[PDB]
Amino acid sequence: SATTIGPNTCSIDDYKPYCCQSMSGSASLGCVVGVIGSQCGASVKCCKDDVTNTGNSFLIINAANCVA
């Protein structure tokens, strides 16, 4: 049904686990930050994006910030 991710889904460098959904006519990846017990029914990729100033209930990845 969906992948229930833990805190150790993507442990590569600084690329955190993100639940990304690709937008239709928008060049933005609609990503939710993966936490312990997230029912990820979307593409669980490992991206770095910005966890420095952003990182709430939603995050938009501009493509060139993910290695998956």
Helix, strand or coil for residue 43? Answer: strand
* β-strand pairing of 43-47 with 59-61: unpaired
CB 24 within 8 A of CB 44: no
Q: What number of other Cβ atoms are within 10 A of residue 50's Cβ?
A: 13
Tokens, residue 31: 């990503």
CB 50 within 8 A of CB 15: no
* β-strand pairing of 29-33 with 59-61: antiparallel
Domain ranges of the chain: 1-68
Q: What number of other Cβ atoms are within 10 A of residue 43's Cβ?
A: 15
Compute the distance between CA of residue 10 and CA of residue 31 in angstroms, rounded to an integer: 15
CATH number of 1-68: 3.20.120.10
